[PDB]
Ligand binder design. Structure first.
Ligand SMILES: Cc1onc(-c2ccccc2)c1-c1ccnc(N[C@H]2CC[C@H](O)CC2)n1
Length: 343
């Protein structure tokens, strides 16, 4: 078997000349040469069979990424595993090798308005498809946006993705959450489980603001600091916006805070396109019900050069799928990856 950093990475004879990339949630990431398609590819090693939550996250993502087919969503080219469930300890997912992620690009490169406009268009075009499938990504951030050498953008990592459930979105004040803190909508800290489409639009708003200044707009250092970052710019919520929050603990926490004024967008971003800031305002709307939807964001004048709804496909079939033990999930993972076996 092929070794990387003294660890097994046996991607068989199809994939050769491995180079270390980094560490994923369930294992190592390497680049390799695909001897069949004659190109270098990205491969991720996943060892999730000892825990139920890691099995659920792996199965969910494989299921979603195998059903989805969209230019702005990363596809799964191949899945490498042992021929039997007994011999299967690891899972290798193969994807097109992308040049960079928006995270690494934002650390050293100034984005022109043209690049910002084109990246946002592709994010929302990919998101329109995801949402039409009744799926929420729930972890949209710059490192989950991959780019090739010609700036083609692809949404990746559906490890925290759920089927949309707006009727069971309510929860109490200060409910724990799993998604990356800086891209969390204000309602997460107040009364929401992140089961509504409006949660992804907030994250896209945060990405748009990050693209305009190369810095995360709300870098909260801890759970409650994140809300205080959001309120420091949006300002105190209106009486109407507070009235919409029925949870007393959440409403009274907001009421206990001193008045904060709204920071004008053109003050935070003085070189930004005015149409870009008008769309940013609609994505970074405090009230989830008034926050713009993915299709209305695509129709916004800022994205006029690209908007073409007949060229913005929707999923053919929306999704439907944790209490299952790791043993039953391993078998479901085995079954879900069977199509990639030589026979
Ligand atoms: C980063 C990353 O983290 N995990 C993966 C991965 C996930 C599933 C399957 C294969 C790779 C990737 C991935 C997927 C596709 N292309 C790339 N390209 C990156 C971007 C350039 C470098 O930062 C490292 C390689 N990575």
């Amino acid at each position: 078997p092929e070794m990387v950093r003294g660890q097994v990475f046996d991607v068989g004879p199809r994939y050769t000349n491995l180079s270390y990339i980094g560490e994923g949630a369930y294992g190592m990431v390497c680049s390799a040469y695909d001897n069949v398609n004659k190109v270098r590819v990205a491969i991720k090693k996943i060892s999730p069979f000892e825990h139920q939550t890691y099995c659920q996250r792996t199965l969910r993502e494989i299921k979603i990424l195998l059903r989805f087919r969209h230019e702005n969503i990363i596809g799964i080219n191949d899945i490498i595993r042992a021929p039997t469930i007994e011999q299967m300890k690891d899972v290798y997912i193969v994807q097109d090798l992308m040049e960079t992620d928006l995270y690494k690009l934002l650390k050293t490169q100034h984005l022109s308005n043209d690049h910002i406009c084109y990246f946002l268009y592709q994010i929302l075009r990919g998101l329109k498809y995801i949402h039409s499938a009744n799926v929420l990504h729930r972890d949209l951030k710059p490192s989950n946006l991959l780019l090739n050498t010609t700036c083609d953008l692809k949404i990746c990592d559906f490890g925290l993705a759920r089927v949309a459930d707006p009727d069971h979105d309510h929860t109490g004040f200060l409910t724990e959450y799993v998604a990356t803190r800086w891209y969390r909508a204000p309602e997460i800290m107040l009364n929401s489980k992140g089961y509504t489409k409006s949660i992804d639009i907030w994250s896209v708003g945060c990405i748009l603001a990050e693209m305009l200044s190369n810095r995360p707009i709300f870098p909260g250092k801890h759970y409650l600091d994140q809300l205080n970052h959001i309120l420091g710019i949006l300002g105190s919520p209106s009486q109407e916006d507070l009235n919409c929050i029925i949870n007393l603990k959440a409403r009274n926490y907001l009421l206990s805070l001193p008045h904060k004024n709204k920071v004008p967008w053109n003050r935070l971003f003085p070189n930004a396109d005015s149409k870009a800031l008008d769309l940013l305002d609609k994505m970074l709307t405090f009230n989830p019900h008034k926050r713009i939807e993915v299709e209305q964001a695509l129709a916004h004048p800022y994205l006029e050069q690209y908007y073409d709804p007949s060229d913005e496909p929707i999923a053919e079939a929306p999704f439907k799928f944790d209490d299952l033990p790791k043993e039953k999930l391993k078998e479901l993972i085995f079954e879900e990856t069977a199509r990639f076996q030589p026979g």
